[PDB]
Amino acid sequence: PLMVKVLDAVRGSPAINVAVHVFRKAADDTWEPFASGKTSESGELHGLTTEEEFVEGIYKVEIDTKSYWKALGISPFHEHAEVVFTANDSGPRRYTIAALLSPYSYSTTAVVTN
Amino acid sequence: PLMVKVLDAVRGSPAINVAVHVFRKAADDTWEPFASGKTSESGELHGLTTEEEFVEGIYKVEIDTKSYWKALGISPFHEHAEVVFTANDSGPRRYTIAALLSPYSYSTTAVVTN
Amino acid sequence: PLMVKVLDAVRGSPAINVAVHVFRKAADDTWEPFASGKTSESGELHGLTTEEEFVEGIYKVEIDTKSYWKALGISPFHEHAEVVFTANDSGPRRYTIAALLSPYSYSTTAVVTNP
Amino acid sequence: PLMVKVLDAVRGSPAINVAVHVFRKAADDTWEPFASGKTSESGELHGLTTEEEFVEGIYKVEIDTKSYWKALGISPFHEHAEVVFTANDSGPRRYTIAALLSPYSYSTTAVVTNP
Numbered sequence: 001p002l003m004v005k006v007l008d009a010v011r012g013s014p015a016i017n018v019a020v021h022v023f024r025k026a027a028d029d030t031w032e033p034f035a036s037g038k039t040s041e042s043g044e045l046h047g048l049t050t051e052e053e054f055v056e057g058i059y060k061v062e063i064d065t066k067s068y069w070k071a072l073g074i075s076p077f078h079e080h081a082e083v084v085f086t087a088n089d090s091g092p093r094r095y096t097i098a099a100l101l102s103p104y105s106y107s108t109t110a111v112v113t114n
Numbered sequence: 115p116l117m118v119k120v121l122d123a124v125r126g127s128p129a130i131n132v133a134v135h136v137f138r139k140a141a142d143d144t145w146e147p148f149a150s151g152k153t154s155e156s157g158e159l160h161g162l163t164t165e166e167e168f169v170e171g172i173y174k175v176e177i178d179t180k181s182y183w184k185a186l187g188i189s190p191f192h193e194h195a196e197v198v199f200t201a202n203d204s205g206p207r208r209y210t211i212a213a214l215l216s217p218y219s220y221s222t223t224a225v226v227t228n
Numbered sequence: 229p230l231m232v233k234v235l236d237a238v239r240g241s242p243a244i245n246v247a248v249h250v251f252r253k254a255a256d257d258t259w260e261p262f263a264s265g266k267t268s269e270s271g272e273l274h275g276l277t278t279e280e281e282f283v284e285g286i287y288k289v290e291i292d293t294k295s296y297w298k299a300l301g302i303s304p305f306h307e308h309a310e311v312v313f314t315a316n317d318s319g320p321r322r323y324t325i326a327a328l329l330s331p332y333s334y335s336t337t338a339v340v341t342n343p
Numbered sequence: 344p345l346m347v348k349v350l351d352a353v354r355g356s357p358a359i360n361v362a363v364h365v366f367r368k369a370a371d372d373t374w375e376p377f378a379s380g381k382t383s384e385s386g387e388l389h390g391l392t393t394e395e396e397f398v399e400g401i402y403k404v405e406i407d408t409k410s411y412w413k414a415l416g417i418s419p420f421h422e423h424a425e426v427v428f429t430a431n432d433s434g435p436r437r438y439t440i441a442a443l444l445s446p447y448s449y450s451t452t453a454v455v456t457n458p
């Protein structure tokens with residue numbers, strides 16, 4: 001039900017081998033590790049979770065943008081990019097979290113479909 | 115070699131049934147019609163052209179954002195969104211032109227891969 | 229009543245010395261040149277027009293993004309960024325057209341206020 | 344030396360009365376509260392800090408986008424928009440953190456200048 005896609009606005013390409021960590025907010029308000037991976041050659045990260053595991057809750061998707069830029073020899077502004085949202089059962093079932101990266105900027109959108 | 119994808123930042127969804135017109139710049143500097151279609155349920159428009167037809171040149175992709183918003187009962191700022199670029203044979207072969215739409219704003223990126 | 233602001237997303241700075249050409253759609257559907265200038269050290273372009281001159285119409289603000297990236301010796305994707313909109317059709321408004329630039333991407337937004 | 348500016352992409356206006364909380368990473372890796380305020384009628388938040396107070400560190404600027412969309416009675420996707428960055432590590436700089444907001448999307452950029 002959850003896919004993360006990362007794009008590079010400098011080279012006009014997927015952002016490949018970018019580390020992505022997903023956390024679920026626990027009852028004590030701390031962020032607990034949920035799922036993680038690295039984006040593929042298409043800039044996409046599939047198979048993070050299952051419908052069964054992805055219960056309603058607040059999730060954080062952290063994208064390691066700083067390591068991405070450093071590997072390209074480019075000095076970036078952000079330590080990482082966060083995307084924090086509520087999964088809701090009465091909305092559509094599938095969530096794509098997309099991020100478009102520049103050294104000093106990023107944009108993020110959610111594409112939520114049934 | 116060319117795909118157009120349109121997303122709606124208000125509803126967090128593909129932008130469906132959006133008209134898209136592609137033009138190639140002619141030798142006299144006018145824009146000649148090249149290809150067109152409407153985005154599908156996925157917000158994507160495939161099959162606009164073929165490798166054979168898509169020679170190097172300056173192309174314009176016009177996205178009918180105004181009709182999109184009006185159909186949703188929302189008053190938009192832009193008459194349309196243009197994306198104007200050079201197709202180059204010595205870059206990667208496949209071009210995705212993506213646009214993310216808001217009533218008073220849009221962003222566009224190119225994802226160019228081999 | 230019309231201001232254009234351009235930012236550089238690679239450098240995290242104003243985009244300085246960016247050429248901007250404004251056109252207005254004429255009675256015969258052609259784009260007539262309306263005003264032009266370059267962004268300053270703040271990435272802003274002021275003084276393009278006056279409240280008297282800036283009548284109702286369809287305007288195109290062409291931002292010469294290719295010349296900017298290339299004048300910096302970078303090879304960008306877009307020829308330019310065009311922002312096309314109806315203005316002043318419920319009476320005079322003030323418009324800021326903002327653009328944030330990357331070699332293969334740009335974002336634009338409008339801030340519209342009523343004086 | 345720190346300014347936060349927030350714009351509304353749905354209305355084409357400044358995003359007014361947006362709550363912003365700034366944190367600084369402490370020696371024990373926790374986020375310590377640093378400064379907070381709300382955007383004005385121009386969508387700008389000035390006066391958060393001083394050049395003396397704003398030392399080297401890792402800062403998080405949390406923009407309370409959910410409260411903004413909901414205080415307007417809209418149901419948005421994000422809880423907030425967080426912008427996390429190292430500041431002043433080559434000496435004092437001025438930072439503008441800009442955010443452009445839509446119910447299911449936001450963009451952020453930094454403008455960093457050397458006084």
Ligand SMILES: Oc1c(Br)cc(Oc2ccccc2)cc1Br
Nearest residue numbers: 098099100107108109212214225
């Ligand atoms: O498949 C996609 C998606 Br979804 C978004 C996209 O563009 C953006 C991603 C993040 C923020 C803004 C635009 C490009 C492609 Br190709």
Ligand SMILES: Oc1c(Br)cc(Oc2ccccc2)cc1Br
Nearest residue numbers: 324326328441442443450451452
């Ligand atoms: O003064 C500004 C700034 Br700074 C950014 C701006 O546009 C953007 C803000 C955040 C993310 C992308 C673009 C518009 C205006 Br008027």
